[PDB]
RNA sequence: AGUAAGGUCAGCUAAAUAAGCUAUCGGGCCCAUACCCCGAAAAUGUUGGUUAUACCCUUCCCGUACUACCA
RNA sequence: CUCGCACACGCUUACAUCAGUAACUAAUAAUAUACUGAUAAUUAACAACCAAUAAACCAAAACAACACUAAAACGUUUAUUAAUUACAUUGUUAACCCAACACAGGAGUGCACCAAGGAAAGAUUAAAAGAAGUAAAAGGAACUCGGCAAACACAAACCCCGCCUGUUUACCAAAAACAUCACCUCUAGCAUUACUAGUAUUAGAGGCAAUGCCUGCCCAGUGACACCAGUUUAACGGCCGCGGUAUUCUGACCGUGCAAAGGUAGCAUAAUCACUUGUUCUCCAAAUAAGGACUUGUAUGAAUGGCCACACGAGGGUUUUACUGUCUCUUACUUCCAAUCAGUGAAAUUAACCUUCCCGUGAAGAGGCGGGAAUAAAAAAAUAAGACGAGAAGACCCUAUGGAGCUUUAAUUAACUAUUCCAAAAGUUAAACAACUCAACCACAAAGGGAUAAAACAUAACUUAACAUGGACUAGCAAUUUCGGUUGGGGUGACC
RNA sequence: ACCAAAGCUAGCUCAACAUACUAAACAAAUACAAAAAUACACCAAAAUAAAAUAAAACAUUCACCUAACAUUAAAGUAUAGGAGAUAGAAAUUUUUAUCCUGACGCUAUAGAGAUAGUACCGUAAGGGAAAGAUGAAAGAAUAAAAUAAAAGUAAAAAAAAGCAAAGAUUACCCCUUCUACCUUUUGCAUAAUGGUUUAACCAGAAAAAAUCUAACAAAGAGAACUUUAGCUAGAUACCCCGAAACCAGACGAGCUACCCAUGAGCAGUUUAAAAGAACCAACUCAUCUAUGUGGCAAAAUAGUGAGAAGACUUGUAGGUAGAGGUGAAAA
């Protein structure tokens, strides 16, 4: 029997929304990824990926807005931060020391010169210096962050060539993609994630991890230690 | 739908096998309706289109056997009775294109009664005729009056 | 028990065109020895059959090797 | 003597009043919550049924003051609408449900452990054997595979394998197996149903098991990647002979050969082929046990992990102390069985039996044949030598041109997923380059003699997102089918 | 003398003719969890049948096996086949209407499963029975007639000795002589197999060549063919029960494995602790031994044990279905 999935909810709100577990079954009712299930209940916060976003099309200048708090985030592996301005309050991801009573600023104005870079500021990648880390990479203009989100990942720009910019991800692997995207400079919180450590098997459960299976299988081909060159490139700008 | 046989020997593997035709998107223009319908054809469809000198020649000249598409006949069926009622809907401001285009076609015009029956299947045609003949039930009332003058007036006729 | 499988200079290897290295013997170089240079000698485990022999087969002998399981 | 009242779920009149039971139901009788006939009954306040849209709102339940990590069920108010009109419909019994039964089994929540609910013995006798309980002289593991069981005991220490809590073969194995924190390898640059409303400190496909000290050498082969050379073993896997040499022994060393490298550290008669009860010491009066050493283990060995340790264990082995009928060696007394009497009354089994012993014979172990012995007929209670006892058309073994599961280097080879090429389809562009003057004209710039062609291709060349057809290539996954015979039983060797 | 025995109807089978083919009943309620009068919708779908088998194996192949429009012949011919098993046409021919339809079919272990798809066994798809006898009148039950004949018992327990009987005998035994019966084997009283006994039911089937009898005969046969004594017709023939499996389509996650929803439990004691800590109940697992072994129980009872604030137990309800689901891998 075909199930729904409860990502139902259409306006956007700031106040956490009920959240169903999958369990790995897909729509169908059968498994497609193992080990997920049995964990502790969590509701969802409603991210706002896209930093620049006017309240009205009347005005489409650059704005400011405040940190409200600094809070946990059941979901992802970062810390999200409430940010208000105008009429309306937003979930961003928080970079590595953003706090409560802190300004942040959203602009989209490519300037020739330079901009200074802030530690939550919000920029296109035009006007950011060359060595800028940055955070929350908007592969087309318009489409939003889908890039680096991760605690205490961070990509570098390398270089701005004919209008297009370059910058390292956080897989040290580059990527090109057009200057006008918006993107955040810092690092993203929760700098010792990869540091934790889980004491007991039953954190994992709580996490929301089920054990793996208990079939030996004899190792392939595949196994061994793997020394590949870098991949090229990747680019999304379509050359007419 | 079929078998065949692996590497065309017949001391071989016995395999199913299915060939289906390579399909694509097409947008067609048709004189008589003057409207462009994006239908999926294939190769062979094009090559009857030029074969046949005209889409709406193919429409027109194959039989239902030939076509085997419910589309095709209802497509038929709609140029079939726009010839024979000879609509002036075709170009209300250039009579003198309307003459011309259902000039080419005069060989293929049947009369009215046969025109609006030539795409239907068994179970349309059928509502169709309920349709025609649906009618609801004469009051007994009705009947009973044309009884009692019919006697009124032959008692008249008697003296 | 059965099966497998090998023997070659003093030693170890490669070829059956019985060679190469080392050891052994003689000489040179040095105060002497060794290194080094020069020269010489040296063998196909065993019996029989393989045109005739050898690499082959057979007999004898030494030694090597695997397996010996279900109740 | 103590699982009692009520709700939910389930069952469906089996409940209540009166009457009858010769017989049917209760495994018996009386008798009637349980069998038969007639009549009657559960009354809603509790429970079911019991509005929609837009907007404001980041702030946990644990006496919640305030905090922790695993980040948490639990809504109010404002606005716009909402038939407005006593009495609607439905569940209300029970000793009950799921297990073939009126079954010592299975069964959620609230409140009590009782004020409520129930009867272990039908009547006798007091044999054996068997089950359960209590007590014991002297001895205290002398029993035995083992201290299993039992006990007035309820302690102490060593070793092996796993770190630990946890998990598994429902119905013969609860473990040393699996999982697990840790470490490491591998594959992926990303959007509307999984992974994920995530984005490399992320998420999958696996290995090995915390910690501590370590994880040596080897890309020849295979596999994978690169898809070319090549690169990879914390990928599958591997990690050596012969001869001589210090008085003797041993062999630092040397000669020679083959390899991709020749087993390094550690530990060790181990859960580790055989030799094996290796040898020695400690423990015991006595040691095929246990611990500690010696150690080529020519078949130990380093993430198919080696080694050491704390804690832990209904795992496996050993020792001391304390206890005891385990035992030397059994005994006494109770209850359920038992035997007699009264009621109801089953099962496997059974060719016909009037159903003895011995020796011999015999399809090779005779109640039945042969030669001899014994021999009034029946009943009740006991012990298990035989009836090749009863039970299951032997699980072992072989045969069957009888099946199936698993694996791959067996034979044949699709679909599907992924990779690559060609064709189809769509689109783009098109008319083309290596002199040099030797003479010599020309104010230049160039020129003339001594070449300045033809041709591009009869179309050509290239690109093509998403879908998608036909024909091939590679890989994954997977499909079909079999696995010869003779054999002093089969396999193995051999043979045809 | 009990238990029993006997009966002939209920209806059924195979055809023929034949209208032309989802009956009977539909007042109300019937696809909300069917039989519940009454609210803003979604609605719907197709992809060659495969294999058991035959070829004494099995891969190409294997009649009928969904859709033929028949009969007499051409003919089991041409062809198609690991050219093996077996598969197999057509051209061309033949066919006079209606009535004469009933039974060398069964009679309650037969005939349909049927008194009935009802009881009953299964969650479900599905499986699926046994069962009737008086007479003209029982408004003739102090009622009547009929066999008193299966195994099993009673009337009537047994008296040395033997495959239970035979030879006999004045006399039942006593005497003498005899190793049950089928199946299977070189050979069985064998301690090799099967049977308690009774009634009912249960297993040889085909006509090419041939032999026997007859008609007519160089010709026979009521067309189509065979013929150097042949042709036509008759008669004479070849079993039953049983696997593990294989393929296709349905129905099953109310037990169990895992997961998604929504709920509910953990008292005391020890510690700054709600720490996959510790002692011990409720609760959940099932270590060891003894009873039990057609048992209370198709896995339990008694004693003793491990966990008992978590990777924990548990109620309701939903999801994944066999080439699969699920799995802290025990196939
Ligand atoms: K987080
Ligand atoms: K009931
Ligand atoms: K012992
Ligand atoms: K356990
Ligand atoms: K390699
Ligand atoms: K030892
Ligand atoms: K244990
Ligand atoms: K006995
Ligand atoms: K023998
Ligand atoms: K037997
Ligand atoms: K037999
Ligand atoms: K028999
Ligand atoms: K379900
Ligand atoms: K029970
Ligand atoms: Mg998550
Ligand atoms: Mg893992
Ligand atoms: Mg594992
Ligand atoms: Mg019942
Ligand atoms: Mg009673
Ligand atoms: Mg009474
Ligand atoms: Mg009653
Ligand atoms: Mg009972
Ligand atoms: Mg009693
Ligand atoms: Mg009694
Ligand atoms: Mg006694
Ligand atoms: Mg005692
Ligand atoms: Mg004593
Ligand atoms: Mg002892
Ligand atoms: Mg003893
Ligand atoms: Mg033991
Ligand atoms: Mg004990
Ligand atoms: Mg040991
Ligand atoms: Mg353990
Ligand atoms: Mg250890
Ligand atoms: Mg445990
Ligand atoms: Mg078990
Ligand atoms: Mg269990
Ligand atoms: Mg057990
Ligand atoms: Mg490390
Ligand atoms: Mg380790
Ligand atoms: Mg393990
Ligand atoms: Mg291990
Ligand atoms: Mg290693
Ligand atoms: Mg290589
Ligand atoms: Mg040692
Ligand atoms: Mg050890
Ligand atoms: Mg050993
Ligand atoms: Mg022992
Ligand atoms: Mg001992
Ligand atoms: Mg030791
Ligand atoms: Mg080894
Ligand atoms: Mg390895
Ligand atoms: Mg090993
Ligand atoms: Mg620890
Ligand atoms: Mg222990
Ligand atoms: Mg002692
Ligand atoms: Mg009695
Ligand atoms: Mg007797
Ligand atoms: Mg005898
Ligand atoms: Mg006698
Ligand atoms: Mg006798
Ligand atoms: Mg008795
Ligand atoms: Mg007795
Ligand atoms: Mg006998
Ligand atoms: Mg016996
Ligand atoms: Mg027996
Ligand atoms: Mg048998
Ligand atoms: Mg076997
Ligand atoms: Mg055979
Ligand atoms: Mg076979
Ligand atoms: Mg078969
Ligand atoms: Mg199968
Ligand atoms: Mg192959
Ligand atoms: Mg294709
Ligand atoms: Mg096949
Ligand atoms: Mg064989
Ligand atoms: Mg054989
Ligand atoms: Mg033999
Ligand atoms: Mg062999
Ligand atoms: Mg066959
Ligand atoms: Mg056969
Ligand atoms: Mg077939
Ligand atoms: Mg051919
Ligand atoms: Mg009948
Ligand atoms: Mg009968
Ligand atoms: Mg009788
Ligand atoms: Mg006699
Ligand atoms: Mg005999
Ligand atoms: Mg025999
Ligand atoms: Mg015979
Ligand atoms: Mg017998
Ligand atoms: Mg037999
Ligand atoms: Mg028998
Ligand atoms: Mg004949
Ligand atoms: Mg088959
Ligand atoms: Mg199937
Ligand atoms: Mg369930
Ligand atoms: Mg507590
Ligand atoms: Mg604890
Ligand atoms: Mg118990
Ligand atoms: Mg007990
Ligand atoms: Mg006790
Ligand atoms: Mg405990
Ligand atoms: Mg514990
Ligand atoms: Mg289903
Ligand atoms: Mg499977
Ligand atoms: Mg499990
Ligand atoms: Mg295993
Ligand atoms: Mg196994």
């Given at each position: 029997?075909?199930?729904?999935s409860?990502?139902?909810?259409?306006?956007?709100?700031?106040?956490?929304?009920?959240?169903?577990?999958?369990?790995?079954?897909?729509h169908?009712?059968?498994?497609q990824?193992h080990?997920?299930?049995?964990?502790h209940?969590?509701r969802?916060?409603?991210?706002?990926?896209?930093?620049?976003r006017?309240?009205?099309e009347?005005?489409?200048?650059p704005?400011?807005?405040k940190?409200?708090?600094?809070?946990?985030?059941?979901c992802?592996?970062?810390?999200?931060?409430?940010v208000?301005?105008?009429?309306?309050?937003?979930?961003?991801?928080?970079?590595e020391?953003?706090?409560?009573?802190?300004?942040?600023?959203?602009?989209?104005?490519?300037?020739?010169?330079?901009?200074?870079?802030?530690?939550?500021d919000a920029?296109?990648?035009?006007?950011?210096?060359?060595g800028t880390?940055?955070?929350?990479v908007?592969?087309?203009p318009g489409?939003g962050?889908?890039?680096?989100?991760?605690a205490?990942?961070?990509?570098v720009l390398l270089?701005?060539?004919?209008?297009?910019?370059?910058?390292?991800?956080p897989?040290?692997?580059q990527?090109?993609?057009?200057?006008?995207?918006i993107a955040?400079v810092?690092?993203?919180?929760?700098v010792?994630?990869?540091?934790?450590?889980?004491?007991?098997?039953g954190?994992?459960?709580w996490?929301g991890?089920?054990?793996?299976s208990?079939?030996?299988?004899?190792?392939?081909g595949?196994?061994?230690?793997?020394?590949r060159?870098?991949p090229?490139?990747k680019?999304?700008?379509?050359?007419? | 739908?079929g078998h065949?046989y692996?590497?065309n020997?017949?001391?071989?593997k016995?395999?199913?096998?299915?060939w289906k035709?390579?399909?694509?998107?097409?947008?067609?223009?048709?004189?008589?309706?003057?409207?462009?319908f994006?239908?999926?054809?294939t190769?062979?469809?094009?090559?009857?289109?030029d074969?046949?000198?005209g889409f709406?020649?193919?429409?027109?000249?194959?039989p239902?056997?030939?076509?085997?598409?419910?589309?095709?006949m209802?497509?038929?069926?709609?140029?079939?009775?726009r010839?024979?009622?000879?609509?002036?809907?075709?170009?209300?401001?250039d009579?003198?294109?309307?003459?011309?285009?259902?000039?080419?076609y005069?060989?293929?015009?049947?009369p009215?009664?046969?025109?609006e029956?030539?795409?239907?299947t068994?179970?349309?045609?059928?509502?169709k005729?309920?349709?025609?003949e649906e009618?609801?039930?004469?009051?007994?009332?009705?009947?009973?009056?044309?009884?009692?003058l019919?006697?009124?007036?032959?008692?008249?006729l008697?003296?």
């Open positions: 029997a075909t199930s729904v409860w990502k139902s909810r259409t306006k956007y709100t700031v106040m956490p929304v009920k959240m169903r577990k999958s369990g790995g079954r897909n169908t009712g059968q498994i990824v080990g997920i299930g049995g964990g209940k969590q969802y916060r409603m991210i706002d990926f896209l930093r620049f006017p309240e009205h009347s005005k489409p200048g704005f400011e807005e940190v409200i708090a600094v809070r946990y985030d059941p992802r592996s970062a810390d999200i931060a409430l208000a301005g105008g009429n309306r309050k937003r979930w961003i991801i928080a970079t020391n953003m706090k409560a009573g802190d300004t942040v600023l959203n602009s989209d104005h490519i300037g020739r010169m330079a901009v200074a870079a802030r530690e939550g920029h296109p990648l035009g006007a950011l210096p060359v880390l940055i955070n929350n908007e592969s087309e489409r962050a889908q890039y680096i989100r991760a205490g990942t961070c990509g270089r701005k060539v004919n209008g297009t910019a370059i910058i390292q991800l897989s040290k692997r990527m090109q993609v057009l200057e006008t995207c955040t810092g690092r993203v919180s929760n010792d994630h990869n540091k934790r450590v889980i004491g007991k098997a954190r994992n459960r996490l991890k089920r054990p793996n208990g079939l030996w299988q004899r190792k392939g595949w196994a061994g230690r793997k020394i060159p870098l090229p490139m680019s999304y700008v379509k050359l007419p | 739908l065949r692996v590497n020997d017949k001391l071989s016995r395999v199913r096998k299915v035709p390579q399909l694509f998107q097409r947008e067609l223009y048709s004189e008589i309706l003057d409207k462009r994006t239908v999926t054809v190769m062979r469809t094009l090559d009857l289109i074969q046949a000198c709406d020649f193919y429409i027109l000249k194959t239902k056997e030939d076509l085997c598409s419910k589309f095709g209802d497509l038929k069926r709609g140029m079939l009775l010839l024979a009622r000879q609509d002036p809907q075709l170009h209300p401001d009579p003198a294109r309307r003459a011309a285009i259902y000039d080419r005069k060989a293929f015009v049947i009215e009664a046969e025109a029956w030539v795409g239907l068994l179970d349309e045609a059928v509502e005729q309920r349709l025609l009618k609801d039930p004469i009051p007994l009332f009705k009947i009973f009056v044309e009884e009692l019919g006697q009124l007036q032959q008692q008249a008697s003296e």
